[PDB]
C-alpha cells in the first residue's frame, strides 16, 4: 500500500464502461479491478453506490 | 465529463472515472437500462448483487 494506482489502469476503467456492460465489460471491470485494487474500491463503491443507498449498511 | 481538470491527481483520476460513472452516458444507448442508469453494472458479474430490477434478467 505504498503506490497509489497505475495511471493507465484508471484509463482502462473509464474506457471499460465504454463497453456494452455485460459481456466483456464484466471481464473488463473485474480485469482492471483485479489489476488495480484502488480502482476496484472506487468502482465497486460506485456500483454499490446504487444499492448501498437503497440498502443501508455497508 | 470530468470535474477535476483544475486539480488532477490520483483522487482526481478515480474522481474522473467515478464522476463519469455517476453520469452514465451509456444511458443514451442503454435506453433500457436507463431505468437505473447503471443497472448494467449491478447486472452481477459474479453470481449476485442485490435484488432491485433484474439488472441482468434473473438474479
UniProtKB/Swiss-Prot annotation, chain A:
Posttranslational mods: Methylation of the KIX domain by CARM1 blocks association with CREB. This results in the blockade of CREB signaling, and in activation of apoptotic response.
Disulphide linkage map: none
Superkingdom of origin organism: Eukaryota
Subcellular location: Cytoplasm; Nucleus
Residue positions, PTM Phosphoserine: 6, 19, 22
Subunit structure, as described in the record: Part of a complex composed of MSX3, CREBBP/CBP AND EP300/p300; the interaction with MSX3 decreases histone acetylation activity. Interacts with DHX9 (via N-terminus); this interaction mediates association with RNA polymerase II holoenzyme and stimulates CREB-dependent transcriptional activation. Interacts (via transactivation domain and C-terminus) with PCNA; the interaction occurs on chromatin in UV-irradiated damaged cells. Found in a complex containing NCOA2; NCOA3; IKKA; IKKB and IKBKG. Probably part of a complex with HIF1A and EP300. The TAZ-type 1 domain interacts with HIF1A.
Role noted for this protein: Acetylates histones, giving a specific tag for transcriptional activation. Mediates acetylation of histone H3 at 'Lys-18' and 'Lys-27' (H3K18ac and H3K27ac, respectively). Also acetylates non-histone proteins, like DDX21, FBL, IRF2, MAFG, NCOA3, POLR1E/PAF53 and FOXO1. Binds specifically to phosphorylated CREB and enhances its transcriptional activity toward cAMP-responsive genes. Acts as a coactivator of ALX1. Acts as a circadian transcriptional coactivator which enhances the activity of the circadian transcriptional activators: NPAS2-BMAL1 and CLOCK-BMAL1 heterodimers.
Name this polypeptide is given: Histone lysine acetyltransferase CREBBP
Organism: Mus musculus
UniProtKB/Swiss-Prot annotation, chain B:
Tissue note: Widely expressed.
Annotated localization: Nucleus
Source domain of life: Eukaryota
Record's comment on post-translational modification: Sumoylated; sumoylation increases its interaction with PGR and prolongs its retention in the nucleus. It does not prevent its ubiquitination and does not exert a clear effect on the stability of the protein. Ubiquitinated; leading to proteasome-mediated degradation. Ubiquitination and sumoylation take place at different sites.
Function: Nuclear receptor coactivator that directly binds nuclear receptors and stimulates the transcriptional activities in a hormone-dependent fashion. Involved in the coactivation of different nuclear receptors, such as for steroids (PGR, GR and ER), retinoids (RXRs), thyroid hormone (TRs) and prostanoids (PPARs). Also involved in coactivation mediated by STAT3, STAT5A, STAT5B and STAT6 transcription factors. Displays histone acetyltransferase activity toward H3 and H4; the relevance of such activity remains however unclear.
Subunit and interaction comment: Interacts with PPARA; the interaction is direct. Interacts with PPARG; the interaction is direct. Interacts with ESRRG; the interaction is direct. Interacts with STAT5A (via FDL motif). Interacts with STAT5B (via FDL motif). Interacts with STAT6 (via LXXLL motif). Interacts (via LXXLL 1, 2 and 3 motifs) with RORC (via AF-2 motif). Interacts with ASXL1. Interacts with the methyltransferase CARM1. Interacts with COPS5. Interacts with the histone acetyltransferase CREBBP. Interacts with DDX5. Interacts with the histone acetyltransferase EP300. Interacts with ESR1. Interacts with GCCR.
Comment text on domains: The C-terminal (1107-1441) part mediates the histone acetyltransferase (HAT) activity. Contains 7 Leu-Xaa-Xaa-Leu-Leu (LXXLL) motifs. LXXLL motifs 3, 4 and 5 are essential for the association with nuclear receptors. LXXLL motif 7, which is not present in isoform 2, increases the affinity for steroid receptors in vitro.
Protein's recorded name: Nuclear receptor coactivator 1
Gene: NCOA1
Amino acid at each position: 500500500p505504498n503506490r497509489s494506482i497505475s495511471p493507465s489502469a484508471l484509463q482502462d476503467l473509464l474506457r471499460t464502461l465504454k463497453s456494452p456492460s455485460s459481456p466483456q465489460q464484466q471481464q473488463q471491470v473485474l480485469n482492471i479491478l483485479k489489476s488495480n485494487p484502488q480502482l476496484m474500491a472506487a468502482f465497486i463503491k460506485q456500483r454499490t453506490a446504487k444499492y448501498v443507498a437503497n440498502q443501508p449498511g455497508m | 465529463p470530468t470535474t477535476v481538470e483544475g486539480r488532477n491527481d490520483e483522487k482526481a483520476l478515480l474522481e474522473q472515472l467515478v464522476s463519469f460513472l455517476s453520469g452514465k452516458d451509456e444511458t443514451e444507448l442503454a435506453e433500457l437500462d436507463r431505468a437505473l442508469g447503471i443497472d448494467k453494472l449491478v447486472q452481477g458479474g459474479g453470481l449476485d448483487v442485490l435484488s432491485k430490477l433484474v439488472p441482468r434478467g434473473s438474479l
